[PDB]
Design a binder for this molecule. Structure first.
Ligand code: SF4
Ligand code: SF4
Lengths: 167, 162
């Protein structure tokens, strides 16, 4: 068992916007509603990590989460984009599809993306080209001109990001 | 304990690291070239390989980490192994008859083996490795372009936990 904070750096470097957001929310709120627990939990499962939810003796909902090295299937991009739209207490979904563009812009700014980077992303989103906007985000983040793959799965994003960071 | 990943090694490690694990388990030691290739791979998956000692004096273990892993080209192009060394890329470094025997022991089908040998003969080491990935995961097309042992692992984990 290990704390979720062991993968803070990893989320920033290799997690797609949709999992990055869930990691953040889990870390700041100490919980996630079902949709989030599924999307994020299953993503981690795909990498080979087991997320564990626990209730602390003193019970703030009073949960604590951990992870360890290791049923349901990790969600693809189309699954995330097209089904289970997030409600107000929810942090799941795809921020390209689900975030109001003003709020998406502010998230992307907090991520230190360039204005030209942001502007290309927002134009792709207007077009409903969510996955291509996410490749664009992959390119900005890894500082490469062509991601070189056709994005269709948050788990693929991770493997492809790691492969670049691994040389 | 290093034996906790014996199973994982058969299911998701590329040939090159699966042989390092087997040799470390059998030989209770690996030379530097081997320790670096396998140790860094493990680091890439979030594990630290170390030897346990007794602090009170004047066994290889693995644990969660509390280091850039070698790529396919780095392994293939450099440091050919000597006798006594278990590092490198089997596709490039093993005698084809010994590679055939290793694949048989991995339960690759006769047809699978022939495809892999043909590819090795043309020097398409990575593509042979992709063919091996496809056969051990029973998928017709791996869908990615392989250039790093940690990528092989990462992609295997997606399938296995799918
Ligand atoms: S595109 Fe696929 S991966 Fe990128 S964020 Fe939307 S869902 Fe997650
Ligand atoms: S190809 Fe890359 S991964 Fe497959 S074995 Fe040779 S080195 Fe290891």
């Amino acid at each position: 068992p290990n704390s979720l904070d062991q993968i803070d750096l990893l989320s920033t470097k290799s997690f797609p916007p949709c999992m990055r957001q869930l990691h953040k929310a889990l870390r700041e709120n100490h919980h996630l509603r079902h949709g989030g627990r599924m999307q994020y939990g299953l993503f981690l499962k795909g990498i080979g990590l087991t997320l564990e939810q626990a209730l602390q003796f003193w019970k703030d909902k009073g949960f604590s989460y951990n992870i360890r090295h290791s049923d349901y299937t990790p969600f693809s991009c189309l699954k995330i984009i097209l089904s289970n739209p997030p409600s107000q207490g929810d942090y799941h979904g795809c921020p390209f599809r689900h975030s109001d563009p003003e709020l998406l812009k502010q998230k992307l700014q907090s991520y230190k993306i360039s204005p030209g980077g942001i502007s290309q992303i927002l134009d792709l989103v207007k077009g409903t080209h969510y996955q291509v906007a996410c490749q664009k985000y992959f390119e900005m983040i890894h500082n490469v001109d062509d991601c070189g793959f056709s994005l269709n799965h948050p788990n693929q994003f991770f493997c492809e990001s790691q492969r670049i960071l691994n040389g």
